[PDB]
Design a protein around this motif. Structure first.
Motif, PDB file in Angstrom:
ATOM      1  N   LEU A 178       9.434   0.074   6.515  1.00  0.00           N
ATOM      2  CA  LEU A 178       9.607  -0.505   5.329  1.00  0.00           C
ATOM      3  C   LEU A 178       9.482   0.574   3.829  1.00  0.00           C
ATOM      4  O   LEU A 178      10.279   0.549   3.175  1.00  0.00           O
ATOM      5  CB  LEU A 178       8.850  -1.461   4.964  1.00  0.00           C
ATOM      6  CG  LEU A 178       9.042  -2.963   5.722  1.00  0.00           C
ATOM      7  CD1 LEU A 178       8.191  -3.910   5.350  1.00  0.00           C
ATOM      8  CD2 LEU A 178      10.508  -3.351   5.024  1.00  0.00           C
ATOM      9  N   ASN A 179       8.485   1.313   4.164  1.00  0.00           N
ATOM     10  CA  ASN A 179       8.189   2.341   3.167  1.00  0.00           C
ATOM     11  C   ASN A 179       9.291   3.235   3.165  1.00  0.00           C
ATOM     12  O   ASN A 179       9.646   3.618   2.040  1.00  0.00           O
ATOM     13  CB  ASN A 179       6.695   3.026   3.406  1.00  0.00           C
ATOM     14  CG  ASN A 179       6.657   4.148   2.532  1.00  0.00           C
ATOM     15  OD1 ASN A 179       6.129   3.988   1.451  1.00  0.00           O
ATOM     16  ND2 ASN A 179       7.053   5.428   2.699  1.00  0.00           N
ATOM     17  N   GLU A 180       9.710   3.751   4.559  1.00  0.00           N
ATOM     18  CA  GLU A 180      10.889   4.721   4.176  1.00  0.00           C
ATOM     19  C   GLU A 180      11.987   4.215   3.942  1.00  0.00           C
ATOM     20  O   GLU A 180      12.991   4.799   3.161  1.00  0.00           O
ATOM     21  CB  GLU A 180      10.962   5.271   5.912  1.00  0.00           C
ATOM     22  CG  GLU A 180       9.823   6.000   6.350  1.00  0.00           C
ATOM     23  CD  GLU A 180       9.419   7.146   5.662  1.00  0.00           C
ATOM     24  OE1 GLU A 180      10.392   8.112   5.203  1.00  0.00           O
ATOM     25  OE2 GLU A 180       8.264   7.323   5.020  1.00  0.00           O
ATOM     26  N   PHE A 231       1.589  11.648   1.371  1.00  0.00           N
ATOM     27  CA  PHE A 231       1.462  10.820   0.037  1.00  0.00           C
ATOM     28  C   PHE A 231       1.918   9.538   0.261  1.00  0.00           C
ATOM     29  O   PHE A 231       1.306   8.690  -0.072  1.00  0.00           O
ATOM     30  CB  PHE A 231       1.945  11.927  -1.002  1.00  0.00           C
ATOM     31  CG  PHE A 231       1.411  11.184  -2.384  1.00  0.00           C
ATOM     32  CD1 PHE A 231       0.254  11.757  -3.005  1.00  0.00           C
ATOM     33  CD2 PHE A 231       1.955   9.998  -2.963  1.00  0.00           C
ATOM     34  CE1 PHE A 231       0.091  11.019  -4.213  1.00  0.00           C
ATOM     35  CE2 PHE A 231       1.921   9.593  -4.151  1.00  0.00           C
ATOM     36  CZ  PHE A 231       0.757  10.150  -4.794  1.00  0.00           C
ATOM     37  N   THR A 232       3.168   9.446   0.571  1.00  0.00           N
ATOM     38  CA  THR A 232       4.192   8.276   0.492  1.00  0.00           C
ATOM     39  C   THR A 232       3.622   7.157   1.617  1.00  0.00           C
ATOM     40  O   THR A 232       3.749   5.972   1.233  1.00  0.00           O
ATOM     41  CB  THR A 232       5.487   8.539   0.851  1.00  0.00           C
ATOM     42  OG1 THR A 232       6.354   7.457   0.233  1.00  0.00           O
ATOM     43  CG2 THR A 232       5.843   8.640   2.068  1.00  0.00           C
ATOM     44  N   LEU A 233       3.148   7.502   2.763  1.00  0.00           N
ATOM     45  CA  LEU A 233       2.637   6.679   3.816  1.00  0.00           C
ATOM     46  C   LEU A 233       1.062   6.362   3.465  1.00  0.00           C
ATOM     47  O   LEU A 233       0.653   5.729   4.388  1.00  0.00           O
ATOM     48  CB  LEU A 233       2.849   7.174   4.963  1.00  0.00           C
ATOM     49  CG  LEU A 233       4.305   7.274   5.657  1.00  0.00           C
ATOM     50  CD1 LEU A 233       4.347   7.875   6.682  1.00  0.00           C
ATOM     51  CD2 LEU A 233       4.941   5.942   5.516  1.00  0.00           C
ATOM     52  N   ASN A 240       0.741  -1.333   0.033  1.00  0.00           N
ATOM     53  CA  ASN A 240       0.125   0.030  -0.047  1.00  0.00           C
ATOM     54  C   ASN A 240       0.602   1.209  -0.352  1.00  0.00           C
ATOM     55  O   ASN A 240       0.917   2.270  -0.759  1.00  0.00           O
ATOM     56  CB  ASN A 240      -0.934   0.136   1.228  1.00  0.00           C
ATOM     57  CG  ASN A 240      -1.921   0.891   1.098  1.00  0.00           C
ATOM     58  OD1 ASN A 240      -1.560   2.287   0.630  1.00  0.00           O
ATOM     59  ND2 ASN A 240      -2.998   1.107   2.089  1.00  0.00           N
ATOM     60  N   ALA A 241       1.801   1.409   1.023  1.00  0.00           N
ATOM     61  CA  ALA A 241       2.669   2.266   0.989  1.00  0.00           C
ATOM     62  C   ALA A 241       3.660   2.620  -0.050  1.00  0.00           C
ATOM     63  O   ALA A 241       3.579   3.822  -0.939  1.00  0.00           O
ATOM     64  CB  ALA A 241       3.432   2.446   2.498  1.00  0.00           C
ATOM     65  N   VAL A 242       4.547   1.788  -0.408  1.00  0.00           N
ATOM     66  CA  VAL A 242       5.472   1.715  -1.190  1.00  0.00           C
ATOM     67  C   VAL A 242       4.945   1.727  -2.430  1.00  0.00           C
ATOM     68  O   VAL A 242       4.116   0.803  -2.865  1.00  0.00           O
ATOM     69  CB  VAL A 242       6.514   0.502  -1.258  1.00  0.00           C
ATOM     70  CG1 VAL A 242       7.498   0.583  -2.157  1.00  0.00           C
ATOM     71  CG2 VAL A 242       7.146   0.455   0.177  1.00  0.00           C
ATOM     72  N   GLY A 243       5.120   2.794  -3.365  1.00  0.00           N
ATOM     73  CA  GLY A 243       4.721   2.831  -4.802  1.00  0.00           C
ATOM     74  C   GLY A 243       5.092   3.936  -5.580  1.00  0.00           C
ATOM     75  O   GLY A 243       6.553   4.479  -5.398  1.00  0.00           O
ATOM     76  N   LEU A 244       4.545   4.606  -6.534  1.00  0.00           N
ATOM     77  CA  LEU A 244       4.946   5.773  -7.382  1.00  0.00           C
ATOM     78  C   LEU A 244       5.442   6.822  -6.875  1.00  0.00           C
ATOM     79  O   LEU A 244       6.327   7.394  -7.236  1.00  0.00           O
ATOM     80  CB  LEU A 244       3.724   6.010  -8.443  1.00  0.00           C
ATOM     81  CG  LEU A 244       3.172   5.025  -9.470  1.00  0.00           C
ATOM     82  CD1 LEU A 244       2.019   5.390 -10.290  1.00  0.00           C
ATOM     83  CD2 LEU A 244       4.468   4.431 -10.192  1.00  0.00           C
ATOM     84  N   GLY A 245       5.056   6.956  -5.453  1.00  0.00           N
ATOM     85  CA  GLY A 245       5.410   8.117  -4.714  1.00  0.00           C
ATOM     86  C   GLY A 245       6.875   8.024  -4.225  1.00  0.00           C
ATOM     87  O   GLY A 245       7.582   9.015  -4.143  1.00  0.00           O
ATOM     88  N   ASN A 246       7.317   6.650  -4.182  1.00  0.00           N
ATOM     89  CA  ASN A 246       8.736   6.564  -3.730  1.00  0.00           C
ATOM     90  C   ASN A 246       9.864   6.683  -4.771  1.00  0.00           C
ATOM     91  O   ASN A 246      10.765   7.444  -4.667  1.00  0.00           O
ATOM     92  CB  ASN A 246       8.929   5.052  -3.051  1.00  0.00           C
ATOM     93  CG  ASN A 246       7.830   4.785  -2.200  1.00  0.00           C
ATOM     94  OD1 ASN A 246       6.865   5.280  -2.002  1.00  0.00           O
ATOM     95  ND2 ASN A 246       8.467   3.983  -1.202  1.00  0.00           N
ATOM     96  N   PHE A 247       9.598   6.172  -6.030  1.00  0.00           N
ATOM     97  CA  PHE A 247      10.435   6.314  -7.015  1.00  0.00           C
ATOM     98  C   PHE A 247      10.238   7.400  -8.178  1.00  0.00           C
ATOM     99  O   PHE A 247      10.836   7.832  -9.053  1.00  0.00           O
ATOM    100  CB  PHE A 247      10.433   5.115  -7.908  1.00  0.00           C
ATOM    101  CG  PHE A 247      10.543   3.685  -7.187  1.00  0.00           C
ATOM    102  CD1 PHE A 247      12.140   3.340  -6.616  1.00  0.00           C
ATOM    103  CD2 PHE A 247       9.462   2.883  -6.375  1.00  0.00           C
ATOM    104  CE1 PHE A 247      12.182   2.205  -5.851  1.00  0.00           C
ATOM    105  CE2 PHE A 247      10.011   2.061  -5.779  1.00  0.00           C
ATOM    106  CZ  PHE A 247      11.209   1.501  -5.440  1.00  0.00           C
TER     107      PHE A 247
HETATM  108 NA    NA Z   1       5.202   5.268  -0.207  1.00  0.00          NA
END
Ligand code: NA
Ligand SMILES: C[N+](C)(C)CCOP(=O)(O)O
Ligand code: MET
Ligand code: NA
Length: 502
Positions: free
Chosen positions: A278-280, A246-248, A17-24
């Motif tokens: 994990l998301n961070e 956004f990222t979380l 859920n968290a990790v996604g397009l917002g990260n990369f």
């Molecule tokens: Na994220």
């Protein structure tokens, strides 16, 4: 009520859920525009005083409501506080994830299409002039999504992009239609590890990039080198907070919906902390070590920052693949990049459609199949607005993905930790926890956080209120009108559910 099969699956589902397009994508841009390391401090603080406490709060509300058979904010806000206005405010926990899902899934379909074309090997072929290298890829993207030459309100998406969008919707549907444990969890246990592996590989390969114009190491230094002159710039703090939200997946009502499927007695403290962490890790360590270090590697720091400011998609869909094309097996590398992006996006999109699906299931007593198919129909239909209307995506991303998430975060925090009471909320959060939240956070949730968010919203409103009324383009007014219509629609659905209850 349906529940997560295992704790691991839960963790990987939330992390998906968290990790996604917002990260990369979003993060590299935000950090680059804000001066690298200078952006990190506010980013970390915002993570401690905002991201974590709100994460825990959303887990708690989610599980609390889920125990009673309610996974969405319209009902939960009512359980915590008895009012009609609580439900009306709860509507945002639907409207936001729906609106965001609309364009988000489209960007995801972009990443998919690009992945396919890069795999098959159909890509622009560059020849030492940066513009001659980037231009082909810019034209590639513009041809894909049908960007106008001047500024022209109408977009002309290629047939391929449309078909790929349909396919993407189909995949989302095939995953979501199998349920929480079978559909989402199963997929998380694969997609997540795959994602981490790909990310690591790309990070290393990128770290190996060195030229006469610079190195990836230069980019890493730029990103991790502290700058205290930007600490007096409010914009940096605002950007950091927005990125944290956004990222979380905070304020999207997604975390809550996912948490409603956690058994009443299971621990949300360590699970939540683990997901956030994990998301961070996926953000600062992985996301930040790919795009920026490469851009700095080839074009140097200044030019990298310039490109970052140029646009959000300019770095991900144009610059990076153009840089890869100049290396041995660069096409395949691009493919890996877009595949990573694709999984990262999918795992999130399912998460943002799940709130709507869950409202339909719980409140309107629809079957999972019907709920999923209808949600997909609505999203797909509305997506035409983002597809054929220039600047619509930006408007939706602003009203929903930016302002709405902060407003909604403040709202939920106020309802849970103030109206519902602080002690009851705290006890609800810590209950069943494998580990307990540090006492200090009690004072962070009750005072610091809501104050910070309130101030932020005040500043934002102050700046935007004059600008809103004067805007030349009609596309944005069309988008606004439409999304307002979506809000009214959802409100009506909530009304129908309420009536059905009686
Ligand atoms: Na994220
Ligand atoms: C507060 N309000 C007047 C907007 C709605 C109140 O409704 P209710 O709590 O009486 O049902
Ligand atoms: C589309 S769910 C909210 C955004 C997501 N958490 C991301 O980082 O991309
Ligand atoms: Na994701």
């Amino acid at each position: 009520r349906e529940h997560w099969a295992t704790r691991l699956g839960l963790i990987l589902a939330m992390a998906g859920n968290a990790v996604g397009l917002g990260n990369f994508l979003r993060f590299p841009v935000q950090a680059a525009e804000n001066g690298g390391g200078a952006f990190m401090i506010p980013y970390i603080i915002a993570f401690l005083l905002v991201g974590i406490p709100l994460m825990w709060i959303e887990w708690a509300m989610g599980r609390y409501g889920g125990a009673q058979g309610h996974g969405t904010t319209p009902a939960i806000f009512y359980l915590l506080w008895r009012n009609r206005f609580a439900k009306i405010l709860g509507v945002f926990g639907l409207w936001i994830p729906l609106v965001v899902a609309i364009y988000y899934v489209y960007i995801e379909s972009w990443t998919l299409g690009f992945a396919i074309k890069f795999l098959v090997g159909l890509v622009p072929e560059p020849p030492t002039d940066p513009d001659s290298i980037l231009r082909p890829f810019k034209e590639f993207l513009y041809s894909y999504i049908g960007v106008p030459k001047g500024d022209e309100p109408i977009l002309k998406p290629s047939l391929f992009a449309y078909i790929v969008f349909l396919i993407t919707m189909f995949i989302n549907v095939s995953i979501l239609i199998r349920g929480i444990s079978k559909g989402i969890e199963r997929f998380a246990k694969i997609a997540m590890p795959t994602l981490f592996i790909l990310a690591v590989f790309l990070v290393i390969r990128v770290f190996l990039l060195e030229t006469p114009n610079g190195t990836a190491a230069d980019g890493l230094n730029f990103l991790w080198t502290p700058d205290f002159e930007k600490l007096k710039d409010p914009g940096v703090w605002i950007a950091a907070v927005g990125q944290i939200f956004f990222t979380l997946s905070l304020g999207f009502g997604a975390i809550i919906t996912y948490a409603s499927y956690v058994r009443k007695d299971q621990d949300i403290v360590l699970s939540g902390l683990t997901a956030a962490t994990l998301n961070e890790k996926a953000e600062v360590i992985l996301g930040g070590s790919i795009s920026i270090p490469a851009a700095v590697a080839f074009f140097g720091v200044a030019n990298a920052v310039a490109i970052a400011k140029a646009g959000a998609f300019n770095l991900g869909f144009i610059t990076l693949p153009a840089i890869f094309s100049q290396t041995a097996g660069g096409t395949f590398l691009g493919f890996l990049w877009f595949f990573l992006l694709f999984f990262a996006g999918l795992t999130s999109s399912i998460a943002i459609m799940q709130p709507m699906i869950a409202f339909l299931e719980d409140e309107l007593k629809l079957s999972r199949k019907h709920a999923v198919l209808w949600t997909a129909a609505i999203v797909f239909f509305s997506a035409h607005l983002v597809m054929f209307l220039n600047k619509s995506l930006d408007e939706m991303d602003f009203w929903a993905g930016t302002i709405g998430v902060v407003f909604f975060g403040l709202t939920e925090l106020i309802i849970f930790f103030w109206i519902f009471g602080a002690d009851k909320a705290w006890e609800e959060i810590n209950r069943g926890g494998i580990i307990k939240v540090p006492r200090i956070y009690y004072y962070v949730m009750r005072y610091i956080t809501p104050a910070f968010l309130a101030v932020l919203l005040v500043v934002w409103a102050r700046e935007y209120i004059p600008k809103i009324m004067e805007e030349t383009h009609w596309t944005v007014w069309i988008t606004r009108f439409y999304i307002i219509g979506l809000f009214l629609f959802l409100t009506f659905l909530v009304f129908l559910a309420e009536r059905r209850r009686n």
